[PDB]
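pasting input
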Amino acid sequence: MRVLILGVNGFIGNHLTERLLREDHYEVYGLDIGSDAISRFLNHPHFHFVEGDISIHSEWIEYHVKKCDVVLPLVAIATPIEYTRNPLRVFELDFEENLRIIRYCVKYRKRIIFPSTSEVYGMCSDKYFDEDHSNLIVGPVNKPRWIYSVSKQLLDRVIWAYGEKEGLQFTLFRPFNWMGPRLDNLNAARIGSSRAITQLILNLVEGSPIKLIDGGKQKRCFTDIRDGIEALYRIIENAGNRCDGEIINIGNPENEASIEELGEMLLASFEKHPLRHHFPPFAGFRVVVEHRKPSIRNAHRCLDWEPKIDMQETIDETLDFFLRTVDLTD
Amino acid sequence: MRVLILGVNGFIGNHLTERLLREDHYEVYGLDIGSDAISRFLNHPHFHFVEGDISIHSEWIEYHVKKCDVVLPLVAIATPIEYTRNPLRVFELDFEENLRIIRYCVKYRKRIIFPSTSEVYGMCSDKYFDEDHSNLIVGPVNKPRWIYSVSKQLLDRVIWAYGEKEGLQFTLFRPFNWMGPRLDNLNAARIGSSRAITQLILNLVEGSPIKLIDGGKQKRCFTDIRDGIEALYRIIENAGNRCDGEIINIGNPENEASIEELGEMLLASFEKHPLRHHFPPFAGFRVVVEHRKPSIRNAHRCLDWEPKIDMQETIDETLDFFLRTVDLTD
Amino acid sequence: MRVLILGVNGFIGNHLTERLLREDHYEVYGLDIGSDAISRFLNHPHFHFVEGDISIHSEWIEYHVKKCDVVLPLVAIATPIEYTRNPLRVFELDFEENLRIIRYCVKYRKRIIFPSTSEVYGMCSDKYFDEDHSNLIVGPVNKPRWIYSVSKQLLDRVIWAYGEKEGLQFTLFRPFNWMGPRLDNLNAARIGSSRAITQLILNLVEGSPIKLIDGGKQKRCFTDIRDGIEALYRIIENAGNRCDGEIINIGNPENEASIEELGEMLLASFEKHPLRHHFPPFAGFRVVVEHRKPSIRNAHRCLDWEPKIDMQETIDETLDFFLRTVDLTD
Amino acid sequence: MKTVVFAYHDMGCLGIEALLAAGYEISAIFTHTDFYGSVARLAAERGIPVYAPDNVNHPLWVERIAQLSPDVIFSFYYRHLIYDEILQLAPAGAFNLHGSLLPKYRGRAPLNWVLVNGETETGVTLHRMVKRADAGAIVAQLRIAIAPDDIAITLHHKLCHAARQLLEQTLPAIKHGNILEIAQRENEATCFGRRTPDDSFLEWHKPASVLHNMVRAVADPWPGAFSYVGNQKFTVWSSRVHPKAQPGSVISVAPLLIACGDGALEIVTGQAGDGITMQGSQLAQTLGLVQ
Amino acid sequence: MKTVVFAYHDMGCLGIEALLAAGYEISAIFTHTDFYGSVARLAAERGIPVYAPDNVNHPLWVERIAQLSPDVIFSFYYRHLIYDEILQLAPAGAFNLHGSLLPKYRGRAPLNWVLVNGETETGVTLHRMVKRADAGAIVAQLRIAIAPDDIAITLHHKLCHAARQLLEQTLPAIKHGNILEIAQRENEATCFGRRTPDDSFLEWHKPASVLHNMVRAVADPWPGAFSYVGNQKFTVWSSRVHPKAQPGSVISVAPLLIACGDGALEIVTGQAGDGITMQGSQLAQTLGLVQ
């Protein structure tokens, strides 16, 4: 099984590649423009680094789709300010360039495992966002923050249509704030790591304040990467072909917190940490979609999966690794 | 600053790459079909060898233009006999293939540093050839030697037009007989080294005669590569953006000599050289555009540059290195 | 013999079409975006109107090249102010779009009869501009009026090269101030009618002044369209294949006048004209390349041609027809 | 008395200064992003919050203004519609300072239109803002004469001076309460829209006096009155009217006189295209004109 | 005495007026296309031919100027090189009016650089134009004091006033003939280039007084001194210097005080990005600053 990861040089690429290389029947083709995040797999016999950029290359990516069996496109900009500061580039990369890769899979009859986004639900009023039943709610066109949500949704619909009409084999997945070791940089155009926890950990690391937009009462769910990657690994395995044509939220709905509470949890774990003294004093909380909890019935059904790691162990492990790998001279 | 040198495997590529690698903020991408002339930079962390050929590759060169910030296209045939023996190939390579590279820069909004030629002035009657004021004079269409001069001039005009109409950032430069260590081979399709001094040094090395076409009374200016490359390096630095849209002659107008005098200078330096005895006796002078002196006001103004090396030190250094690196068994 | 005229809706198109339809073995395909100038041939059995525009169409023009035997591309902007006000459009239309048509002829092995321009000689100091021997002289790049001259010249050289290398059958012709009935409008992008006489006749018709740029001492030659079209017709006939690869000035070198003298001749013919009273009083002469006389040896040799109409009869006939067809209500 | 002010340009600056001198508490100033004074700079300097939204007719701004609890609202040359949902927030009402003798010249650019039309007088009016723009009852109106040699900029300074005089006494009067206002008679109203480049185009068939007024109406620093010499645009920066030829034809080139439908217009200074300003005689040569 | 004048800005206007008042015959004025007076408008109004070529160092202009036969040439704030082939056409020489106490502050923007450097004095100098720019012998030099509260615009008006005073007496003196000029001592000269946006960038590690001078040097109508709050640019329009924290850190937000390498700088007024000017306290909130 040849697995093509586009945008391997990051969080998901790292953790997914580790997982697949444990198993004896995977060849991982990791496409990216750099390899610093995964440099320890470069010498692995079943890892294959592929030089590339999905905006520049046509034929090279197309080739690698043909060569491989399953494809995971992880290249996208999901930086909120960018939705308003550089909307066209968000659209071009996240929509147009990924659409080309989708069409390569259709053409060579390959399976695609596509990262949809939890942002597709928008201001959905269900308490549990359900992939198969929840209505998707966005604001008017004069609220440009929604361009990312709606681009990703239209891409889902296009995948769905290729599936219905052209026999594309797909699974869509929606990560909810995955977190752990080897988080993407905040401005890396790679899907997967919780931007909210990376930002907060960064605040503590830099000694900048934690912004609570309107008191930080908006609630989010957070998912350990060990749980998340286990689910994604099962989607790849696709026991019984039970993931075919499915849309699967991957998150831990019991790991719910407002940004305020997430703030306090991180701070507690931080102040307790043996390396805390390398970092500045706490600059403080700064007052400047109200809920986003996944239904995980689809993951229960298709993957026989449920999350095993509590909030506190994921927080602690995520923070610990981040602090330990910070370069203190830079 | 990512500098893309197309045709790096030569004189300018060598000396430019050395210069840029001294500075800590350059990444040099050296594109060519071979690397023997620059093999000592292949292991340098900030040099990147790129396999390529501007007549064969489309997408690969295009990619590297997008990836980089500034582009120096040094691939061209400037061998006079070729202008008449293979005019179509001179036109195709020097004009058509370089025009593609120009259009890549326009498209990805990259800066181009383009080697125009001192041959553009042709039979201009000004004593000092002035980039901004001198008229360009060529012969009728039945004098095909002018195809090179006019191809290069039209390319300048096309660059100029892209600059005016499409916001292309360019600087054009015109080298006047640059010379020093690591001269291009006489039939290498790479711009930069004085074909007149390479030929003469070759005559002495081979024991063939020095041809003085009509007595060799036509006068030329000669420029040490240390002076030339310093100027080109400043064009790259572009302090104050003062090189934007500029055309810059780079030569030493005080290093003027007829071919006859250049002949005698080389011969004197040769006969004095400790390795002269490895080479044949002098076969003699053989009787078989009358002036080509640059104005350098543009280089004075834009680069704060003036040439520092006298005729005799450049002659001596150029000859010395050539002789020392000749393979005496071949 | 199928003759394809691109830009038929004008002066040359009209007079050429009349001439070819007199002969029993021509089928004329007249391509243009309008037909008002040639509407009296639309019903002729051997005239075929073709809808088209050389900047918009690719395949349609290509088709008609394949279908036909000989091609005359007459679409070009030769309005001097345009060389400086809209240089890019002059270049795009006159050079780039005509180059496509040239390459269609090369590809389908068709003969091309191409209107070069008398402007190619530029500031040539020969008294008689000679297609085979005169040097071409233009100003520096900072004198943008020369973009038209040099675009046309490079096109000639490209035609010449296709001829040498690819067996293209061509004849190049250079008209010198052809004039007669049915002059092009001053801003029509169609080659052939003397812009200097059209302007002057327009001055008289409108009651605007005649501009003598620096006293109007620059001398030009003027050619009756009956003489000109006879020559062009013989190039089409190509007796003995004597026009193959030839460049032919078509003008009357004895019809020489400064703009001042041309002015006075027109005015005399005007004041004498029975319809002069429909036009305003003379607004007067207004003081605001010094010679351009063709050698016609090539036309003598290849076409056995020499001009038969004196200055005065061409002036009178040209003016008379213009005045008679002016719409006095508009 | 607390107030929320909408202001721009010199009139905006002097209105703010007058409110401050009259003891009003300015909670916020609404203005616009861009030779005149900057209301934003004046606000920034006086420590008054200042906002420049492109459009305030939205609940976001209604609520922000409501929170400021103005007793009264003033508009001093603000250029956009301030809808009633905002104006009704002020119990004492909203008042606008308009540069004309209302009901004449309601609308845009009254400074320029009164010169275009050759009026011999104009003025400043402070009036209540009602549903219908520029039609509310008049608190006070102060007339100024327009001199034959006034141009837009000199008239502008006179209007600003009149506005200062008017506000100095009326603002304290408003602070004391409602003033018996003077109704505008609709049958006497005239309204003008924003001037387009076409509105400063000189048509030579018109009387020289009318063209002269057009030149005065948009003289520097305004865009200038313009025409064409064939296809060449030129601007007439200053002119003079003179007492038998086709309109638009050149009577003389030094001085440069153009025949009009009636009388002649001397182009004292002007420019060709985007070229520099020069005397008419030089402009004539530049344009290739001859008698 | 006939002259050809190169002029721009307020200095150009006052220099032209002074030449006219001194009886000089101005044959032509060379200026530039664009708060200050327009030399072109003044020329157009006075009926003096005016040209604004981008570059006069070409034979076309040498010949045009030669035909005007100037006895003397004056440069009053013209911004481009006028090469010797032109200047040598005037037998009485060429003179330039420079806004500094030459030989100090030769070059560009002496008005701003003297404030940047905290000079307590500057002045205007009329000097002969020689091969070397701004280095010719001095005809006269008039010093003015720079007050602690002067900013670019107030100093500009003082310099213009000094220039008027200097020219009023020196122009008639030149009309009488050569004046014994005062040589500039090269060893005492300083030269400054055109200011780049980077030259007005506030670096907080510097003394508050130095930053305060930078604010003064480019205050409105100049571009303003600027810095960043992370990735957000802001401009400091006016400031105050105050007598134990990281440089660049916020000491207080009302008033807005920023710790410097030494002392603190109060941002009295400023703006965020291209937003409007506001008081420092409001700017602090706009930028998300806290103590």
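fyi Residues 194-222+254-288+308-330 of chain C form a domain with the UDP-galactose 4-epimerase; domain 1 fold (CATH 3.90.25.10).
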